[PDB]
Paper text:
The model protein in this study is a 134 kDa membrane aspartate/sodium symporter, GltPh, which undergoes complex conformational transitions to transport aspartate and coupled sodium ions across the membrane. As an archaeal homologue of human glutamate transporters, it harnesses energy from sodium gradients to transport aspartate via an “elevator” mechanism. It is an obligate homotrimer of 134 kDa molecular weight that can be reconstituted as a protein–micelle particle of ∼300 kDa. During transport, the three GltPh protomers function independently, undergoing conformational transitions between the outward- and inward-facing states (OFS and IFS), where the substrate-binding site can open to the extracellular solution and cytoplasm, respectively.
Residue numbers in the entry: 2 to 418
Write the structure that this text describes.
Amino acid sequence: GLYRKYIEYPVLQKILIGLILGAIVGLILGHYGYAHAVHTYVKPFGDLFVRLLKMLVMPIVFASLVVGAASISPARLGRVGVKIVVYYLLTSAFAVTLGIIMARLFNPGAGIHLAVGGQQFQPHQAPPLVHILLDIVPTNPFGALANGQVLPTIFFAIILGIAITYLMNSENEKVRKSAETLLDAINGLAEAMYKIVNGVMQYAPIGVFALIAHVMAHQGVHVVGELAKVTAAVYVGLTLQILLVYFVLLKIYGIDPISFIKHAKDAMLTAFVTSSSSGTLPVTMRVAKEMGISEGIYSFTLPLGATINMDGTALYQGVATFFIANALGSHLTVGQQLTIVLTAVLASIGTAGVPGAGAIMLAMVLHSVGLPLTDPNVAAAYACILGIDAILDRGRTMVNVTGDLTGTAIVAKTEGT
Ligand SMILES: N[C@@H](CC(=O)O)C(=O)O
Ligand code: NA
Ligand code: NA
Ligand code: NA
């Protein structure tokens, strides 16, 4: 029936269509009253979409880090591996720092003041520094998962992944066999969650329509200018990452920047369209071959780099956090800003390569910096940046793929003779 044709039609196009019609309906219903009608009928559809994304946070956070830590563990890291791993972490750290600078320059979301319940967001008291540091170690690992504590879950997931790698290098056959079965079971869980993510994005066009209609009807056209600055900040941030960071690195190691861009045109263009790193990987592997990279070099960095390296996602997270904080009216302190850098890098490592995966991993940063999503004011602000995720997703994927190709160039140059 008609249900079929809705599926094969491109997902990215459907979300874009929902955004346009949702805005127009809100403005038409902006006048003539009927604002209460949108709040009581249209709104519950939007809340269903939000609850689906919140469900996927905890299982992905635990499973992705265990698999990720077991691939970059020092036990199984070779001479080529340690060089490429150091490259990934350093570039990601600089990327989120650049996003913080861009957010301050534009100050997105400052104009809007939202109080859904008639009470503005009240910042919570901050415990002493020693208490915060000691609470990273979970007393009960099972209790952290059940209570939705993010930071304690990060600590347990990483150490569990590293421990399994040492077991797989043991001498006892039974010990090694047990380790592989445990890792496969966790890996199977992680892959299953990404399939659910794809299913949710099919419902996104309906969910985006409800969220935009509610926002435009109440706040008004003032939102359009505010969201415009967010989109401008990210894309201007991304183009600086290509020019300021990648180009100078090529100059230092002697790689021609202009020639590099010409060869990598095919990989960059397809990544923009599909907005998925996994889909771009066969094309990305193909492009490196013409460049003269050794087969062994790009058969390891590119597979690992596709998921481990996501500089564009990290820059997106840094800017998104400031927009939510400014919208609520709160101000991020120096300590919280430093916390963003650490959390954003970890969130990028665990983020999936499927379109729209960045939104789910944004909950990690919000919890860490002291902005819980349970607060209705936060949930309102989280809804707007969620609606425009389709536009920002295209730009993020291009930078992620470009970094992987660039990183291999230096490693191949250095490893060779
Ligand atoms: N589309 C991104 C993931 C994301 O931004 O959620 C990638 O595949 O690298
Ligand atoms: Na990186
Ligand atoms: Na990547
Ligand atoms: Na990742």
